[PDB]
Ligand binder design. Sequence first.
Ligand code: NI
Ligand code: NI
Lengths: 142, 133
Amino acid sequence: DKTTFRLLRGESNLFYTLAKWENNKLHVELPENIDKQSPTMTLIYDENGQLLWAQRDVPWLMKMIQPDWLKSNGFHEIEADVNDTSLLLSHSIQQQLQEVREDDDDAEMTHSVAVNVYPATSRMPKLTIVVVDTIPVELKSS
Amino acid sequence: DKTTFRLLRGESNLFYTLAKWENNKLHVELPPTMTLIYDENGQLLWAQRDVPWLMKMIQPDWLKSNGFHEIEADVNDTSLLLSGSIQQQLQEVREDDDDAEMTHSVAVNVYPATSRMPKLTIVVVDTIPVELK
Ligand code: NI
Ligand code: NI
């Protein structure tokens, strides 16, 4: 909750820091195995809500992010089913998800989402960074 | 265990975001943990507190890659990691065995060189021992 919020807001900063504008475009300089260094998903939008960069293409995830949310700092929650939650990681969370599947394969998983607004800068346009924790809330205890 | 590393690596990304390279020197802004920052050759550039016994615990091999480790320490050394709140619990551990051994979680994170910073390795240590919550 509070530690989730802080660690998610902290990952937003890492990506902001590592982001650059070259060739009239946004690029992020990330270590080789970023996906594996953290169980998070990041998206980066402009002041008008247009996607500029996605750690990956995640349809269900992109329809959950209400444009409204991009105009202010916030902590939200989105929902996915076990099947989508598992593609977010596609390692041992997989066994746990199978266990959720054994009792209810239509089970809903809740994911925390941090929205961070960055006012434009001399070397950086106004930007909105969105960070989604990929470990559902129902599996945190483990 | 797992969230332990995630919270330590969060304290690490913080220090990396506040960091700056000016006058050819690393510049660090002040954001239960202790942080140390090293360069590409594995030389210390900054320690949040100078704790000699801890530095000799950070195996140079660990600075090459991101990783999660554990280091042992007696009660005298663990209590030197805080200057002292938790100190009270440390006194009763000491009171029933001055040779008690303490474990501390250690997160190592590597940040590749870029166009605003050179390759760094930030090391974060959980100052509260594993067996004291
Ligand atoms: Ni179904
Ligand atoms: Ni002794």
